[PDB]
Design a protein around this ligand. Structure first.
Ligand SMILES: C[C@@H]1N[C@@H](CCCC[C@@H]2N[C@@H](C)[C@@H](O)[C@H]2O)[C@H](O)[C@@H]1O
Length: 440
């Protein structure tokens, strides 16, 4: 067992009310909005296929020229109340907002740099408007923050000289300052989600990552901090040199998910996944025909998958430069909202059920030991196999929407055939099981 000063703090899952809320929420939205929304993946007449928020990198644009996009930042159609209504209608219980992406442009008027919304034609504190509007709908607000900053010349990718160390030390102070500023300007913030912490410079400064976590927790009671921030004494990221999770929840599942049979270890800690609608576009890209775009059901499948393994899911949106959402994203939010309004008893405040995975879909477990079968793949056999853990029996099955009774036939010790509904629901659907544990 290795000695560590900057390794894991928490033993298991936090069980204070603020973390229980973080968890019970389950479904969130991600907002990526920054200067990248203006070119929308096109630079100097060339459309790049890579992630639009990385266009500065793909098109090799220098900082001074990239940040000159500030002069066109004037989202006339922006309306924070509209945004919050859209999130409410989607059924999202929280929103994660890009306060500052890699480009360094801040969506709040930071006093620690000139590359902020204050020095744009628009001028207004976009972040503060969003915080207020989402909080007015009862939606928690989480802050995405990129440590890596392409606008600050003191940033370093690695520490290869005493000059690199000096510059980077200044950079970390600048970062602390921005963070303290965010925490105190917007004290309803529930989470900081760090990105851009993979460079060797950061891995070599584990002490700073632990310090940032302690500092923010002192400033914001009950705040959650993601594992991605954290590096230990040895530069091991997410989980420390003793394999213990750092931060409050695991945050590595980006555009992919743990395997439902092979990655059951994830059920031992809190975790959150994120995803994109296209293959890899977080910021607004003007041409979505360049990669596969997920359908609503494909998105709903990933949401439920996450919850079935004890994790949250955050679906991403990349608003237009004008401050409105593109029509594909409006259609997505409305379709997810419709399905959650009907079946969201199986999602909100649900967790891992402890049952062996079956082909038809996923199980989730409610707060009162309800076991929901969320069916995505309808068997031609008309029978949904349910294999119970030791000592567990199924006393009843009920179609969630209609209350109708569903026949349960015992086929072996520990296994049943739960019939499909008499009328095919025509969409992914929920059967609620009543289970009993012998003297869950
Ligand atoms: C949440 C998403 N994170 C950003 C993509 C991060 C890519 C991470 C890759 N892995 C590192 C080790 C680097 O090689 C970097 O390319 C996206 O722009 C979104 O903000």
């Amino acid at each position: 067992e290795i000695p560590l000063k900057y390794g894991a703090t928490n033993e298991g899952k936090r069980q204070d009310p603020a973390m229980q809320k973080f968890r019970d929420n389950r479904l969130g939205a991600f907002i990526h909005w920054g200067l990248y929304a203006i070119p929308g993946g096109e630079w100097n007449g060339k459309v790049y296929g890579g992630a639009a928020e990385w266009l500065k990198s793909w098109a090799k644009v220098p900082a001074d020229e990239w940040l000159k996009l500030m002069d066109q930042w004037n989202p006339t159609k922006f309306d924070a109340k509209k945004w919050a209504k859209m999130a409410k209608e989607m059924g999202t219980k929280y929103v994660k907002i890009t306060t500052k992406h890699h480009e360094g442009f801040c969506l709040w008027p930071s006093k620690y740099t000139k590359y902020t919304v204050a020095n744009t034609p628009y001028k207004r504190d976009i972040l503060g408007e969003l915080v207020k509007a989402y909080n007015d709908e009862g939606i928690d607000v989480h802050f995405y923050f990129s440590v890596m900053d392409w606008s600050n010349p003191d940033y370093r990718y690695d520490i290869k000289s005493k000059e690199d160390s000096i510059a980077f030390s200044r950079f970390l102070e600048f970062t602390d300052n921005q963070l303290k500023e965010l925490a105190t300007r917007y004290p309803t913030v529930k989470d900081f989600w760090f990105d851009g912490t993979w460079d060797a410079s950061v891995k070599k400064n584990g002490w700073w990552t632990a310090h940032a976590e302690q500092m923010l927790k002192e400033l914001v009671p009950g705040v959650a901090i993601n594992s991605r921030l954290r590096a230990d004494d040895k530069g091991k990221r997410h989980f420390d040199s003793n394999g213990r999770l750092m931060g409050d929840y695991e945050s590595g599942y980006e555009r992919r998910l743990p395997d439902p049979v092979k990655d059951l270890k994830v059920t031992q800690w809190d975790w959150e996944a994120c995803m994109t609608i296209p293959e890899n576009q977080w910021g607004y890209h003007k041409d979505w025909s360049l990669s596969y775009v997920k359908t609503p059901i494909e998105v709903i499948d990933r949401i439920v998958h996450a919850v079935s393994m004890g994790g949250n899911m955050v679906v991403n949106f990349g608003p237009q430069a004008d401050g409105d959402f593109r029509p594909e994203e409006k259609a997505m939010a409305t379709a997810i909202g419709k399905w959650m309004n009907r079946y969201g008893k199986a999602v909100y405040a649900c967790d891992y059920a402890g049952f062996e995975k079956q082909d038809w879909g996923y199980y989730t477990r409610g707060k009162n030991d309800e076991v929901y079968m969320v069916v995505f793949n309808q068997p031609y056999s008309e029978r949904l196999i349910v294999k119970t853990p030791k000592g567990i029996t199924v006393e009843k099955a009920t179609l969630l929407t209609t209350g109708e009774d569903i026949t349960v036939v015992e086929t072996t010790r520990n296994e049943y055939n739960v019939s499909v509904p008499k009328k095919n629901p025509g969409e992914p659907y929920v059967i609620q099981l009543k289970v009993r544990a012998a003297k869950y």
